[PDB]
């Protein structure tokens, strides 16, 4: 069966964190989250491609 | 297209960030990273399941 993730690329782009003393440097976190966002986009695109292919194969077999 | 994935759950665990006098609250960033690590695992399992399912259906169509 299909398994869903918790977050999306847009939710990570738009997440706001509160601040505090000795918090993590914002640019360090944001640059790393940007790499994560691109991975979410890559994962989502490949799943979309694999699920459309899965639907086509199941249709030929029906 | 291809699977040009940049990071792994282990790389996310190992990543360190410099701190500032102020910055993003560490608790909140770390707990968000935990959710992300769990999603990388889910994405992987979903892709593996679809790849093997599609292989099996392709083979059956021709055998
Ligand atoms: Zn499943
Ligand atoms: Zn499946
Ligand atoms: Zn799925
Ligand atoms: Zn930088
Ligand atoms: Zn989509
Ligand atoms: Zn692909
Ligand atoms: Zn270190
Ligand atoms: Zn894999």
Author numbering:
A (entry chain B): -2 to 0, 5 to 63
B (entry chain A): -2 to 0, 5 to 64
From the manuscript:
Since GpsB in both species interact with class A PG synthases, we next determined whether the rules established above for the BsGpsB:BsPBP1 interaction could be applied directly to LmGpsB:LmPBPA1. Therefore, the K32E variant of the N-terminal domain of BsGpsB is as close a surrogate for the equivalent LmGpsB domain that could be obtained. LmPBPA1Arg8 and BsPBP1Arg8 are equivalent in their interactions with GpsB. Of the other GpsB-binding determinants of BsPBP1, LmPBPA1 lacks an analogous BsPBP1Arg11. The sequential equivalent is LmPBPA1Tyr11, but this residue is completely disordered and its mutation to alanine reduced the affinity for BsGpsB1-68Lys32Glu only by 2-fold. LmPBPA11-20Arg8Ala and LmPBPA11-20Arg12Ala mutations reduced the affinity for BsGpsB1-68Lys32Glu by >15- and ~4-fold, respectively, and had significant negative impact on the LmGpsB:LmPBPA1 interaction by BACTH. Reintroducing positive charge into LmPBPA11-20Arg8Ala did not restore wild-type binding affinity in FP as LmPBPA11-20Arg8Ala,Ser16Arg still bound to BsGpsB1-68Lys32Glu with an affinity at least 10-fold weaker than wild-type. It would thus seem that LmPBPA1 represents the only GpsB binding partner that employs the TRxxYR motif in L. monocytogenes.
